[model samples]
Target: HWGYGKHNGPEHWHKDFPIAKGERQSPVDIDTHTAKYDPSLKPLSVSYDQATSLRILNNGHAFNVEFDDSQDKAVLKGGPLDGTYRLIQFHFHWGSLDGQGSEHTVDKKKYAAELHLVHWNTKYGDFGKAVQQPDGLAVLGIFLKVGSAKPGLQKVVDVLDSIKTKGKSADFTNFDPRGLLPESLDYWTYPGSLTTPPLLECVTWIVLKEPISVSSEQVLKFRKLNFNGEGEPEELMVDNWRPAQPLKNRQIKASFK
Candidate 1:
């Protein structure tokens, strides 16, 4: 299994997952000055139903809020995507320290953390089938900064204490993902792969330009999570993010000038 440790870290990923070295790898540095402004880019339309939220779990890597994607109860549209994408799950990647934890950086500057809301194209039938296709997924990446505590996020944080160990999960419902987003829908769009193993190059990345605020105390709460389960030596679940990848020949399109 791949982990963000010295032995099975990002550098060793290519040894087992060949696609990790693919050109469309994710968490790339976004040089805003160099990104092209696309006037044709449509405004992002996101509709998430709080009832679709299922439960929260610690999957040994990151804490994920799973959703019921059996139907189009919650969906994303009108971005750079060709069709609707159904929300599957959402998770975050953070660091051990406060200043640096985000997966994607802007102008080479890192944020406190990063949140990824994973969705799969409904045209492909299901997440399993969609993931194998080139345009199977569309992930919304929201950067998190250290500032005043986010009231919307407190619901998520309050449950973290119960799910501190790997594989631990608790019932979570009535949570709308919209509350976590920034006021502006402005974003940078590009083609990229998953940041984890298999590293599928099927994602249409929608990275928000403005970041939401999280208190310094909330940032430290994420570090308290454990990557290991009962009877195992505890490994703090912090700094799970992968390094930025090469941009290659890909062109980044901006929704705002």
Candidate 2:
């Protein structure tokens, strides 16, 4: 039950989940100047079937749209990955204000929000089993900027009303996650861990360089979300993002110059 509140926030998570202090922790600052351009890096290939999208849920931590990953219906390949990774779920991280919310930063600049598309390597069987391995997971990160309303994001925002409360869920099908990505496939890749507990250090982080636009009003609606369930003391689900972690000796590889 770790939350983003002062009592049980990211700083206190290490008390229970020892891996929170691991070297490969996620949400690292990307220093473009220091990142190496990899000419050998292959173009990212993403294939997602809208029919594979199932339901959306408010897990208190954040709202996630779960996908049916029983097969390789939706998979991500190329880029920094050695094998195909099946899409499992996608979620967001935002702050109470528009100034700062994104988990990952570039040149120490925080965005209005951030989106995570979670995927697992099929070689390890399922997500549960894959998480325990070194090359288990892959997450695509996209920053959200405040601008005009994004038509592609309206579908996701429309359902927030139904899942405003923690643990609530609703049918969310026929939604292709590709619509949420930016035009350019240019990105930065590195070795990192899951931002949340268990804090598994198995993710090959692929963060897009360009950000997608979202309306100012749309960003404000995210603040209405509650971290606590119905009838509990209302804990606003803002600033649910973990701070940037140390990069250590890891080198960030850029797919494009």
Using lDDT as the measure, which candidate wins? 1
Best by TM-score: 1
Candidate 2: how many backbone clashes? 0
**Per-residue lDDT for 173-215 in model 1, tens only?**
8888878989999999999999998899999999999999999
After superposition, the stretches of candidate 2 with alpha carbons farther than 4 Å from their true spots are: 49-51
- Candidate 1 lowest-lDDT run of ten: 42-51
Q: What local lDDT does model 1 show for residue 69?
A: 95
Q: After superposition, how far is residue 8 of candidate 2 from its true place, in Å?
A: 0.5
- Residue 41 in candidate 1 has what lDDT? 86
List ranges where model 1 is wrong by over 4 Å.
Answer: none
Residue 111 error, candidate 1, Å: 0.5
How accurate locally is residue 225 in candidate 2, as Cα lDDT from 0 to 100? Answer: 85
